[PDB]
């Protein structure tokens, strides 16, 4: 929809979401970074 609002909504939640997963991700890249 071209008429959707492009500006950011300031009413978004500014607090940290405690329901984010506290477990460490096993899917992180295990290879050394050449960059």
């Amino acid at each position, epitope marked *: 929809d*071209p*008429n*959707a*609002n*492009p*500006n*950011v*909504d*300031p009413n978004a939640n500014p607090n940290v979401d405690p329901n984010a997963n506290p477990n460490v991700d096993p899917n992180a890249n295990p290879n050394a970074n050449p960059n």
Partner: antibody
Amino acid sequence: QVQLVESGGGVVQPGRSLRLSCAASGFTFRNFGMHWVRQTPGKGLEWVAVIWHDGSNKFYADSVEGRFTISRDNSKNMIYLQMNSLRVEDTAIYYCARDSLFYDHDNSGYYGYWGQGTLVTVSS
Amino acid sequence: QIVMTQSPATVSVSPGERATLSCRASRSVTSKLAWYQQKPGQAPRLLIYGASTRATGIPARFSGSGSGTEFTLTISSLQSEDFAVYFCQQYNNGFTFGPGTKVDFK
């Protein structure tokens, strides 16, 4: 003092590519979405493209669909419009204008602050 | 999308008189319509946004009204600096602009 300055104008031959840059200052750039407006004598104002606050969603007009590319760099506060394969119908004054004066969820798409504009001429 | 027209093309109104402009859209645009001020050599300036609300710094002299497919822009007492061409835009479905109505001295 929302100041928008347009550059990258000039004269180019048909079938080539030109790049327009629009520098924005006087407001939080990354929190708003910018547009591109075309003014052709004998036709009036014509919309070109719109970009989101982070460039996630881009919408172009039919007359420029598939040929013009809009982009933005929030780390430099600049708005770009890449016009590839320009034609003789693209000669007009191009305006960089911000969407809305302030945030209103149900009111967006009108232009609050306009730039002085740059001239791009396509001819042989 | 929505074809936009303005009538009449030009108006001849002496300073201090009331000037009225009419804007008509092919399809309903509800309450999403803006007016712009085009002076020769100058970028458009936002006068009225949505249906009637006025941009900050715009004097109360500029008054907008209308809804649906009929919108009007009325100047209560036209001054010297307001002699220009006004553009009517919808942003309900797409982004289209009107042909433009120029205000001229009588």
